[PDB]
Design a protein around this ligand. Sequence first.
Ligand SMILES: C[C@]12CC[C@H]3[C@@H](CCC4=CC(=O)CC[C@@]43C)[C@@H]1CC[C@@H]2O
Lengths: 218, 214
Amino acid sequence: EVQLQQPGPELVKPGASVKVSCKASGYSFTDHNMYWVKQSHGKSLEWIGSIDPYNGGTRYNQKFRGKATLTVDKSSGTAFMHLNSLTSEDSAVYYCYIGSFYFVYWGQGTLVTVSSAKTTPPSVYPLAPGSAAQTNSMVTLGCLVKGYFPEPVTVTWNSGSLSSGVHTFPAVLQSDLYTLSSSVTVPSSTWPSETVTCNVAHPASSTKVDKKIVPRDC
Amino acid sequence: DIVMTQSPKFMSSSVGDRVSVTCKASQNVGINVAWYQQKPGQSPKALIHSASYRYSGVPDRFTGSGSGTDFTLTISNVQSEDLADYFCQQYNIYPWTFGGATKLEIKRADAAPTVSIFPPSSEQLTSGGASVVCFLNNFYPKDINVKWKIDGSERQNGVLNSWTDQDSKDSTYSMSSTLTLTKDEYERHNSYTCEATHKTSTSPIVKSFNRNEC
Ligand SMILES: C[C@]12CC[C@H]3[C@@H](CCC4=CC(=O)CC[C@@]43C)[C@@H]1CC[C@@H]2O
């Protein structure tokens, strides 16, 4: 089945370049043009350009000419978008996608952050109720994911098998560091008697942490 | 370049109501207009091509109309899962261009926030910092205020707040509030209070702990 796999997030210094890839499978590669699209935080979408794997021809949005260069490597079915002279204006999710009358398929996008600030792994802190407890109710637990750069982190609960009751809040940026929290709500009869664990992944620093929530010690 | 001007920017609808989003092109684009839905943290999903052709797998509650410059996406019998951004795109002429997103909120009965307060973890205390977290979960409508008190005194510096997108299941909102202090300031005071003020009540929901106190 059709897949467009794009790599994970990129942090780049101002003035540098980045090359984002889009690996295609599950269909005949030359059947479809590959479109590239920019989504900046809270702005709309911008078509960057397209490339046609059949003949290698390219078409560019004039606003991106001189800045984006589209190539394909047919031997691995991979399209590439090279972006030079990067500034913070270029921080965005970059997408590749294909389409026809019959379907449209987008890749998951590659977040590119253009910043001078350094990568910093998160500190992960369990949030457990202060000695208060309750009977026959719900209990809300949490995880504080503090002091990291760049975005994103991913947070799951019990490796993602706890789904309902979960709120993961958008990170806040302060002085070159992000902080977010996540809460989970489970019946009081299931915790602390059954384990609840917060899983935090920070791909930019290759950080993976599991923080079990344990009752506060008085 | 064709400019696609979308309206309204925000729309609010009860389940079962009929919503419509309009998309006005600055020049004629025939019928080469598509409509997209994008839920938070997800890639865009095509709904409609050629202004009125629904894609395979899209519910029949989604319809498109219009030609030339005026285009309209209609959602009949709106469902809570339809909460998303929506936007149009013209692909009649290069460069292809997109309208700005319309955010659809689904209406629901008012709910008071569920408030919980959490003291700093011991592992954060060992590193010389102290963050106090308060969750205000699953409330409607989206407006809400939170106040911190330290030993009964209002505390305004050092607070950072964050708000979720509308919940896909129960159509509510949540907010997190974090008060961050040095370990020293945290250990110079005893009482820590989170207060939530929401239209569901004229009385704040108060939540507290003392730095001692089994
Ligand atoms: C523009 C579009 C991608 C390109 C598609 C278009 C539908 C019509 C179409 C048919 C083709 O065979 C070429 C690609 C195109 C031109 C899609 C509608 C939405 C999607 O973004």
